[PDB]
């Protein structure tokens, strides 16, 4: 309910430690398009202890929620954000169109294609460092073989 | 002394949830087996018949509810589920929706 | 790594049907997320999809001569089988294997091809 | 019946950049997974593009794909040709009834 979201180039990641856990509230902000869970219950969220939990969230388009599962590929997947082979947690996802929509154009969302490897689970890609896609190198400007990462 | 043979159709990756024990959305809310089940699990792929180019959406599956089945029980209430912390008057609307 | 390779006769005729079979090494037959299909290759011209199955005895053909195909899989030698029916002067080309992935979301490339076969329809 | 249309003949000087494009008439490009087969003359084709971004290992990097929705297209972007991308391009994908579309096929070849 923060009312502004990041894109998935900058995915927001919050500390939860030293507080109760009260899960019995997340079902009053979205109607669950999409609520998988993979290695907890759906019931038994206020059963359960953990050592660390973390929330992330992003924005991405409809056809880019299915990667967003252990063992996906894509963009969004091998390049904005990796899960793990064994995650163990849930997953939340519903429309924003009518929010998160701008009549002119909302170019404030943005995503990496790919730069030069696939990324690891749980980690940030911040370098905004031109694309190099030929033999010959460059740098500074954009050009022929020398793209945005986004 | 007497067989009973239950028919259903779900996912691939939902068909390991049909063995007792399991864990999950069909196990659990849909079709619960008990821990000392006899019998036999059969299960084939029937995508040329129960799938469509523009979406089969005749077959539904339960996602949440109040609690976990029994095993060889049914729930064939359509009735619309309530999960906010307020009441809605059994209506759909705010914090309250479809359950299948 | 995983292989296949075709195998048949390497030149009928018309009025005919036009058998063959791929036997699979590296991998069995009978593994799900994974279909067997067969593409043809007129000399000269592009690919063509003939049609690919699931162990599961689900054959999917392509619009364009599926009443004229047939596709069988065996569990035991990991061979599966193609069967054409009223083979024609145009149908000669050059077929290849081929795996397709549907593991994940999606179906999607055609992971492992085979050598290619090279048959003629000649009277 | 969805198709996918692509030039029949690209040719550019070595060191640049080509580009292969399939467009799909009739539906979406983005509803199903296209891929890019190197073909060489008298060999089996091989995938070099993947679920319209990824790559096989042992192709080298000089391959990359990109999706247009906004014109309904599947492009195929080669920075830094060499002697060996002298094969053919096979654009592939699928309809919606499950049935594998292939692309007419597009002729790559350096300018020596």
């Known amino acids: 309910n923060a009312t502004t979201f990041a894109s998935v180039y900058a995915w927001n990641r919050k500390r939860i430690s030293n507080c109760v856990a009260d899960y019995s509230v997340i079902y009053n902000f979205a109607p669950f398009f999409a609520f998988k869970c993979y290695g907890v219950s759906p019931t038994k969220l206020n059963d359960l202890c953990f050592t660390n939990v973390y929330a992330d969230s992003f924005v991405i388009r409809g056809n880019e929620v299915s990667q967003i599962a252990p063992g996906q590929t894509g963009n969004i997947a091998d390049y904005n954000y990796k899960l793990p082979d064994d995650f163990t947690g849930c997953v939340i996802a519903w429309n924003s169109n009518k929010l998160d929509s701008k009549p002119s154009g909302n170019y404030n969302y943005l995503y990496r294609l790919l730069r030069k490897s696939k990324l690891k689970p749980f980690e940030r890609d911040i370098s905004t460092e031109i694309y190099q896609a030929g033999n010959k190198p460059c740098n500074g400007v954009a050009g022929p073989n020398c793209y945005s990462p986004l | 002394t007497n067989v009973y043979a239950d028919s259903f159709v779900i996912r691939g990756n939902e068909v390991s949830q049909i063995a007792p024990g399991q864990t999950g959305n069909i196990a659990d809310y849909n079709y619960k087996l008990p821990d000392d089940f006899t019998g036999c699990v059969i299960a084939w792929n029937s995508n040329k018949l129960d799938s469509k180019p523009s979406g089969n959406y005749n077959y539904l599956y339960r996602l949440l509810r109040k609690s976990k089945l029994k095993p060889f029980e049914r729930d064939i209430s359509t009735e619309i589920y309530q999960a906010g912390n307020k009441p809605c008057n059994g209506v759909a609307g705010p914090n309250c929706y479809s359950p299948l | 790594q995983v292989q296949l390779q075709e195998s048949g006769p390497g030149l009928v005729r018309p009025s005919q049907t036009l058998s063959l079979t791929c036997t699979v090494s590296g991998g069995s037959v009978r593994n799900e997320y994974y279909y067997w299909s067969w593409i043809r290759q007129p000399p000269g011209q592009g690919l063509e999809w003939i049609g690919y199955?699931?162990?599961?005895?689900?054959?999917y053909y392509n619009p364009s001569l599926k009443s004229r195909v047939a596709i069988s899989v065996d569990m035991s030698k990991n061979q599966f089988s193609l069967k054409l029916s009223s083979v024609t002067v145009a149908d000669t080309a050059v077929y290849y294997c081929?795996?397709?992935?549907?593991?994940?979301?999606?179906?999607?490339?055609?992971?492992?091809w085979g050598q290619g076969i090279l048959v003629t329809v000649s009277s | 019946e969805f198709m996918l249309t692509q030039p029949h003949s690209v040719s550019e000087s070595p060191e640049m950049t080509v580009t292969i494009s399939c467009t799909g008439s009739?539906?979406?490009?983005?509803?199903?997974?296209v891929q890019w087969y190197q073909q060489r003359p008298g060999s089996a084709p091989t995938t070099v593009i993947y679920?319209?971004?990824?790559?096989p290992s042992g192709v080298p990097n000089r391959f990359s794909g990109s999706i247009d929705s906004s014109s309904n297209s599947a492009s195929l972007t080669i920075s830094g040709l060499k002697t060996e991308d002298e094969a053919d391009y096979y654009c592939?994908?699928?309809?919606?009834?499950?049935?594998?579309?292939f692309g007419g096929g597009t002729q790559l070849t350096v300018l020596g």
């Open positions: 592939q994908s699928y309809d919606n009834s499950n049935v594998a579309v």
């Open positions: 199955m699931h162990n599961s005895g689900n054959t």
């Open positions: 679920e319209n971004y990824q790559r």
């Open positions: 081929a795996r397709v992935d549907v593991g994940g979301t999606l179906v999607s490339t055609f992971d492992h």
């Open positions: 009739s539906g979406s490009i983005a509803d199903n997974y």
